[PDB]
Design a protein around this ligand. Structure first.
Ligand SMILES: [Cl-]
Ligand SMILES: [Cl-]
Ligand SMILES: [Cl-]
Ligand SMILES: [Cl-]
Ligand SMILES: [K+]
Ligand SMILES: [Mg+2]
Ligand SMILES: [Mg+2]
Ligand SMILES: [Mg+2]
Ligand SMILES: [Mg+2]
Ligand SMILES: [Mg+2]
Ligand SMILES: [Mg+2]
Ligand SMILES: [Mg+2]
Ligand SMILES: [Mg+2]
Ligand SMILES: [Mg+2]
Ligand SMILES: [Mg+2]
Ligand SMILES: [Mg+2]
Ligand SMILES: [Mg+2]
Ligand SMILES: [Mg+2]
Ligand SMILES: [Mg+2]
Ligand code: NA
Ligand code: NA
Ligand code: NA
Ligand code: NA
Ligand code: NA
Ligand code: NA
Ligand code: NA
Ligand code: NA
Ligand SMILES: [Sr+2]
Ligand SMILES: [Sr+2]
Ligand SMILES: [Sr+2]
Ligand SMILES: [Sr+2]
Ligand SMILES: [Sr+2]
Ligand SMILES: [Sr+2]
Ligand SMILES: [Sr+2]
Ligand SMILES: [Sr+2]
Ligand SMILES: [Sr+2]
Ligand SMILES: [Sr+2]
Ligand SMILES: [Sr+2]
Ligand SMILES: [Sr+2]
Ligand SMILES: [Sr+2]
Ligand SMILES: [Sr+2]
Ligand SMILES: [Sr+2]
Lengths: 237, 56, 92, 194
RNA sequence: GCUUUACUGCAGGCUGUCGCUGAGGACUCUCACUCCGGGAGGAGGACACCGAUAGCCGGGCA
RNA sequence: ACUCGUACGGUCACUGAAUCCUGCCCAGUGCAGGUAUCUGAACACCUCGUACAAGAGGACGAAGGACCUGUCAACGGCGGG
RNA sequence: GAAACAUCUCAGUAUCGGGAGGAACAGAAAACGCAACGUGAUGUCGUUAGUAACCGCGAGUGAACGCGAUACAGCCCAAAC
């Protein structure tokens, strides 16, 4: 047959690429040596094309103008601090060791100094729970208990733009506009609506898959479609 | 719209032009590569054994 | 059918009639050192292996008699042409 | 009596034993951070180098080359192929890693000609070989009664034509009798059956 | 051309084993190696990656 | 490549606005988890064999399979008497 | 081609990448093994011979030593000191 859509993706052609040239900034945490004496004033609140959530423009003491991942409540004029001895106020970035337990946190690092990996999407947050000299247990937005290094930096507060998922797209055109700002091919044609040559579920006189949908993990690209290594399917039971 | 005569009307794009190296009208002005002598692609002149019958 | 374990018959080794003992030919174990074994290892590579990719055929509904006729005095055996028998049981 | 050279030779008979085991463990850390072809002022194996034709003279260059370990880096067939020709994984190249190393060295130095090469070890993913190259145009070599043969026009690109030592061995030309029916005088004259 | 529990194979995935690979049937360490850090340094660690082989799955492909 | 992206994410599929609803079946097939025991390759190891080697057998036993469980908005099924 | 076809065959052919010369390559035995009290660098030509050898032992595939010729040419390092 012909290569399936998921295989065309990997080649990284224009249709599948993200409009990177239209993106604003790669929202990472600032680099401090030690001492904490790095603070800044919020100049503007901009829209970020990459994540459909707002981003805050901050001007630091040493003359550095950088866009930061905006938590909720952060406005123009507000002073944000980045470092070890930073104040435990929403919008400040300090390592997990210095942040008290039971406090909602965002833009958490995986490895110390990476700039932030977890809890970055609209309105989500990570929850810092247990402390130790070796481990800081953080509960990520998926409900997973992630054991991290207490030296991993994070920003206090929930991410801004909460409740975006609450309002329906209503029409196809609204989806179109959102998708044009992302690295995704849209609309989605069902495999079951294609020809046998194009997809494992293609063909037939009527529309239905040709085999069961639950495919093995060991399946090769071109065959790994439908329900990938499903532990279970359905709602009931 | 038919693929024949009505689709021929849009053909006013210049691609293949006179080559600086070989003199043939095969220098693709968009690719900046010659389809005849390989100018723009290789220092060595484009030649292939299939351009003639195997035992010749 | 029934077959006597011991009976009088011709011995081609003794050149006279002696009491023979009948035994079913037990399959001798393979050494894996014959030419065909070395050819299987040599000729098998990438893709199909021709004859070495074939899997052993079926069975005939009834197999022929596979027996050894052992002489009672000289102790040497001889083979005979087998006959189709669904079962072969020995008497004594 | 024994030469000092004989001790470099004896050390290299077992590169995983003695002081050499520790030396290689150290050196390879620096080598892995080095390039594909690195010119070195002095050979790692003096005995082997001198034995192969090296001289501490002007116009004699040495270079360490790293080539990857393993079989062929082959692409799977994109058209109709019979089962025998459908392989990817078990296919190995006909030229040995030493020969690949020599060619990569000769490309880096377009004016020089390959004299010989030798192995200087390997790790888990690559092999290192040091290639002795010669300047056919330097008068220091053109007047050398032992090396001036390499100056001749027919010795141009000698490595790319298999005229090198590792070339001739890889071409199956070692034996003068039985087994070399399809190798001598050339692989091509014998219909590529060697 | 297309399908599959047709024949035979080929990619790919999973898994054991050998090499890289080191010190004191479960374990400790650090020095290779990997990743994070601008750096200092941190995490991991003889595993993983990679090379080789073996078993299983394998119309994704021939 | 996705990705100047991080689960309110994005990948892979099915169904196809709203409204009222979406029953029963896990035996087969698929996927997934488990597993006393069974089966399960090669390397190393043990026995035999060979002044060596081929080779024969053993011990151990990974994934996988047997076996057990979960799962149908998973492939599907919902009859005769 | 094998009157299908998978090994085999077409064939190391077509085609592709790299490179030298006026010719290339080969070449002074860790050779041969008409086993010898024998030959004596290498190409090549004739022959050895469709012989030995390979092969779903099918179709097909296929040398060499030697011999008669052509032309003839033997040397330089590394190390010892
Ligand atoms: Cl979306
Ligand atoms: Cl019988
Ligand atoms: Cl060269
Ligand atoms: Cl002779
Ligand atoms: K064929
Ligand atoms: Mg960012
Ligand atoms: Mg787009
Ligand atoms: Mg659709
Ligand atoms: Mg259709
Ligand atoms: Mg298909
Ligand atoms: Mg329908
Ligand atoms: Mg349907
Ligand atoms: Mg020739
Ligand atoms: Mg990196
Ligand atoms: Mg097919
Ligand atoms: Mg035919
Ligand atoms: Mg036939
Ligand atoms: Mg042939
Ligand atoms: Mg011979
Ligand atoms: Na062989
Ligand atoms: Na060169
Ligand atoms: Na050969
Ligand atoms: Na067709
Ligand atoms: Na069922
Ligand atoms: Na035919
Ligand atoms: Na046919
Ligand atoms: Na054959
Ligand atoms: Sr980043
Ligand atoms: Sr960075
Ligand atoms: Sr279908
Ligand atoms: Sr239900
Ligand atoms: Sr019209
Ligand atoms: Sr136009
Ligand atoms: Sr170009
Ligand atoms: Sr050409
Ligand atoms: Sr073979
Ligand atoms: Sr095979
Ligand atoms: Sr039968
Ligand atoms: Sr050249
Ligand atoms: Sr509806
Ligand atoms: Sr089931
Ligand atoms: Sr002579």
């Amino acid at each position: 047959g012909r290569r399936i859509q998921g295989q065309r993706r990997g080649r990284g052609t224009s249709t599948f690429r993200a409009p990177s040239h239209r993106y604003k900034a790669d929202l990472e945490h600032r680099k401090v040596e030690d001492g904490d004496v790095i603070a800044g004033t919020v100049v503007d609140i901009e829209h970020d094309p990459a994540r459909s959530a707002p981003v805050a423009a901050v001007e630091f003491e040493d003359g550095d103008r950088r866009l930061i991942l905006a938590p909720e409540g952060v406005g123009v004029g507000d002073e944000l601090q980045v470092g070890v001895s930073a104040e435990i106020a929403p919008g400040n970035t300090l390592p997990l060791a210095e942040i008290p337990e039971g406090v909602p946190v965002c833009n958490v690092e995986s490895s110390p100094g990476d700039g932030g990996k977890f809890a970055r999407a609209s309105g989500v947050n990570a929850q810092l729970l247990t402390h130790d000299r070796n481990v800081a247990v953080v509960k990520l937005p998926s409900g997973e208990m992630k054991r991290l290094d207490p030296q991993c930096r994070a920003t206090i507060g929930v991410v801004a733009g909460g409740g975006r998922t609450d309002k329906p797209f209503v029409k196809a055109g609204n989806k179109h506009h959102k998708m044009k700002a992302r690295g995704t091919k849209w609309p989605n044609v069902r495999g079951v609506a294609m020809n046998a040559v194009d997809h494992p579920f293609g063909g037939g006189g009527r529309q239905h898959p040709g085999k069961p949908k639950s495919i093995s993990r060991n399946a090769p690209p071109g065959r790994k479609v439908g329900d990938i290594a499903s532990k279970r399917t359905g709602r009931g039971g | 719209t038919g693929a024949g005569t009505p689709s021929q009307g849009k053909k006013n794009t210049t691609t293949h032009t006179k080559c600086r190296r070989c003199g043939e009208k095969s220098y693709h002005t968009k690719k900046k590569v010659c389809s005849s002598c390989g100018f723009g692609k290789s220092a060595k002149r484009r030649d292939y054994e299939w351009q003639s019958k195997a035992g010749e | 059918m029934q077959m006597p374990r011991r009976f009088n018959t011709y011995c081609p080794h003794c050149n006279e009639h002696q009491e023979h003992e009948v035994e079913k030919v037990r399959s001798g174990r393979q050494t894996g050192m014959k030419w065909i074994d070395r050819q299987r290892e040599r000729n098998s590579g990438i893709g199909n292996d021709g004859k070495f990719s074939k899997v052993p055929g079926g069975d005939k509904p009834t197999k022929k008699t596979d027996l050894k006729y052992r002489c009672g005095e000289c102790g040497k055996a001889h083979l005979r042409e087998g006959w189709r028998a669904g079962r072969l049981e020995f008497q004594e | 009596a024994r030469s000092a050279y004989s001790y470099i030779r004896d050390a290299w008979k077992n590169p995983g034993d003695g002081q050499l085991a520790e030396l290689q463990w150290q050196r390879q850390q620096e080598w892995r951070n080095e390039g594909a072809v690195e010119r070195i002022e002095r050979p790692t194996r003096l005995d082997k180098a001198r034995s192969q034709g090296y001289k501490a003279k002007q116009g004699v260059i040495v270079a360490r080359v790293s080539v990857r370990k393993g079989s062929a880096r082959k692409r799977r067939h994109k058209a109709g192929r019979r089962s025998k020709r459908q392989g990817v994984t078990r296919i190995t190249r006909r030229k040995d890693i030493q020969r690949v190393a020599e060619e990569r060295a000769s490309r880096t130095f377009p004016n020089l000609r390959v004299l010989n090469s030798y192995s200087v070890g390997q790790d888990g993913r690559q092999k290192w070989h040091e290639v002795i190259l010669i300047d056919p145009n330097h008068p220091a070599i053109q007047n050398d009664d032992d090396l001036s043969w390499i100056c001749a026009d027919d010795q141009a690109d000698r490595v790319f034509r298999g005229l090198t030592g590792a070339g001739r061995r890889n071409r199956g030309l070692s034996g003068k009798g039985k087994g070399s029916e399809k190798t001598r005088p050339s692989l091509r004259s014998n219909g590529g059956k060697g």
